[PDB]
Amino acid sequence: VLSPADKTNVKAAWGKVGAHAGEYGAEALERMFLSFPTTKTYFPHFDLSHGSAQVKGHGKKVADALTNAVAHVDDMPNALSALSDLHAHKLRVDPVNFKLLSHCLLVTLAAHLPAEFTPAVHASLDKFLASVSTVLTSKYR
Amino acid sequence: VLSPADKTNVKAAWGKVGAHAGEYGAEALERMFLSFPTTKTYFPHFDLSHGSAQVKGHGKKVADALTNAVAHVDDMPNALSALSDLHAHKLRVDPVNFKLLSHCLLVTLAAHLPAEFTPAVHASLDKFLASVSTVLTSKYR
Amino acid sequence: MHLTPEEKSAVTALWGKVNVDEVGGEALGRLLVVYPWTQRFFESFGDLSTPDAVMGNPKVKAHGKKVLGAFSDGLAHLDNLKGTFATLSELHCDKLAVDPENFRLLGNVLVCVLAHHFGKEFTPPVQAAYQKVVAGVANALAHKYH
Amino acid sequence: MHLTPEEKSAVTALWGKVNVDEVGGEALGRLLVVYPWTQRFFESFGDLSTPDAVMGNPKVKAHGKKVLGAFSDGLAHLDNLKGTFATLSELHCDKLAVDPENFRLLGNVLVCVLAHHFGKEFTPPVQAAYQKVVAGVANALAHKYH
Ligand code: HEM
Numbered sequence A, B: 001v002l003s004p005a006d007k008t009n010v011k012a013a014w015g016k017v018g019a020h021a022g023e024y025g026a027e028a029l030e031r032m033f034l035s036f037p038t039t040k041t042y043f044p045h046f047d048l049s050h051g052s053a054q055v056k057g058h059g060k061k062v063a064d065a066l067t068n069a070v071a072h073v074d075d076m077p078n079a080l081s082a083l084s085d086l087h088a089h090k091l092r093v094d095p096v097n098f099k100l101l102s103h104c105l106l107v108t109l110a111a112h113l114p115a116e117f118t119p120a121v122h123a124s125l126d127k128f129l130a131s132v133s134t135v136l137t138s139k140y141r
Numbered sequence C, D: 001m002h003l004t005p006e007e008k009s010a011v012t013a014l015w016g017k018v019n020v021d022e023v024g025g026e027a028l029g030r031l032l033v034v035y036p037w038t039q040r041f042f043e044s045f046g047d048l049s050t051p052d053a054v055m056g057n058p059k060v061k062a063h064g065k066k067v068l069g070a071f072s073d074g075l076a077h078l079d080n081l082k083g084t085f086a087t088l089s090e091l092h093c094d095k096l097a098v099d100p101e102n103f104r105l106l107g108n109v110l111v112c113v114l115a116h117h118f119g120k121e122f123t124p125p126v127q128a129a130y131q132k133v134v135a136g137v138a139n140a141l142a143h144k145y146h
């Protein structure tokens, strides 16, 4: 569970992301495709080339969802219910892949928020992405 | 989340275990130590030799907690509070190891409860062990 | 493989007693039931709405036999699983887009099926040798992903 | 270790810019803070009660520098990690009893630290080379476990 401290940490770092969310969403995907090539198996229908609009479009959607989760940090299960359904029933992504993206998201934030990416915030952001992943995977079986 | 069917399946299977839980506990550990030798790093103070009294003893303890878990299938978090505490603050076993013990427990049940180890009971037991794992690692951070 | 002559013999000897037809159908079927998300690859098989519908589906049973078959042949090249599964690795990557994690889930299901079947015979030391083989196979199969 | 010549150059070029003293302390400190369970091996280190307590602990800083030191040496023998890390593998297992999963957590934290430090310079392609490297080191340190 996320503590008050964690909640403040996440609203704070995400706060800074602001308007670049979209772009950071795309970059996290690209990092993931390059470091964990097996994740590509879920986007056979995508142009995964550098600067692909499909990746850009997708990064934006992922970032919009995270932004939505932050806005409803006290009701994540409900705010993300629809996405939980989608992943469980249509996409059916193996649970292990959530940890891979999570990791690339952290690298992206670290690369862009030097001042805010403190040990304390790093810890809070990691617990956050793990909670997001848990919700997204809760209806798998 | 454990469905009513799941809870039923589990109570049944465990019902058949009966007075053998202790030996199954002990057998599950032995299988874990041989198959996943990295797990041994948490029992440096044990005699991990075959038929060791420490292992048998521990096997009973583990089996007992599962029993208690099955009995309070509806209130696991509360029934295992102390155990969640112990693991998170004292033992501090890495979360990946719970999956290895769970697996060795299924293999053990499978090997001893042929008739009862149907595909549907296998699915339920797996979910159950996963739930127990979640509970034991929920206070880690 | 990093199998001991003793470990090699153990694998080999239990395998000799396996009915691939039955173990294959059971392993693949259990997979689709325990880990429902693996069904994403078999929509064309029919109705997998229930354990019963999965365990009974002939398309499932036949895929299972095809899978254990290839597995079975790999046990004859235990000293070069890499080379044995190279083409199958490319195929699974490039044509099927199957996440290699599935290879590991199956492996575990396989071990449970063997225990199930051989009871007493499937001793701790015997499972240990099989755990090494299923992990080795999963690795060979995932080797050509890019 | 599928390090392409170009991936190896990239690993090497950036490592040239690292202050191992500093990075070592940050990576170790951050591990104890993000995954507190890892603190189990350091009860003789004193106060690890808070992030400042951890990040600032002279003992944490000194040990981090030691760990990264052995890691840097590893980077000079990318060809023979297993040989390079054999005595250390043995010690972590037999004397220290450190679960190898700890080596992977540290690898991921190190990658985050490198990103933190190099900003835009730690490009998608550079991250991918370091991912291969930390995995390779984690595997070499676990090779002697039994
Ligand atoms: C916290 C992590 C994740 C978040 C927030 C997330 C969120 C989303 C969202 C918002 C969409 C678009 C749904 C729509 O069409 O409205 C989506 C689709 C999708 N996601 Fe997830 N997802 C996450 C993890 C993953 C992972 C780890 C993978 C696989 C590696 C994945 C694979 C997919 C795929 C294949 C689609 C459909 C894309 C398309 O065809 O346009 N997701 N996700």
Ligand code: HEM
Pocket (backbone or CB within 6 Å): B039, B042, B043, B058, B061, B062, B065, B066, B083, B087, B091, B093, B097, B098, B099, B101, B102, B132, B133, B136
């Ligand atoms: C199915 C999940 C598990 C359950 C229900 C469980 C239950 C228990 C119980 C009942 C005890 C003894 C408490 C006491 O002494 O009063 C215990 C202790 C312990 N457990 Fe857990 N355990 C589980 C998973 C694990 C795993 C996966 C590991 C490591 C591989 C582990 C490592 C330990 C250790 C090292 C001890 C202390 C043994 C001693 O020194 O006596 N546990 N556990």
Ligand code: HEM
Pocket (backbone or CB within 6 Å): C038, C041, C042, C066, C067, C068, C070, C071, C088, C092, C096, C098, C102, C103, C106, C137, C141
């Ligand atoms: C022990 C591991 C496995 C082995 C040895 C294996 C082997 C095979 C073989 C020999 C084929 C025949 C296709 C051809 O030659 O054209 C095949 C097809 C296929 N496999 Fe795998 N496989 C394994 C694991 C998996 C898993 C776990 C899945 C998904 C859960 C999977 C999904 C598929 C699919 C979707 C096909 C195509 C079937 C069709 O054409 O309808 N495989 N595999």
Ligand code: HEM
Pocket (backbone or CB within 6 Å): D038, D041, D042, D066, D067, D068, D070, D071, D088, D092, D096, D098, D102, D103, D106, D137, D141
């Ligand atoms: C890149 C991975 C690692 C490398 C290269 C490394 C290297 C070293 C070295 C050179 C030593 C000193 C050897 C000696 O005392 O003779 C050491 C000791 C130690 N390492 Fe590792 N280490 C690594 C990861 C870890 C991790 C992740 C942990 C725990 C989370 C750990 C726990 C320890 C402990 C507890 C000691 C002994 C501390 C003491 O002196 O009391 N190591 N390590």
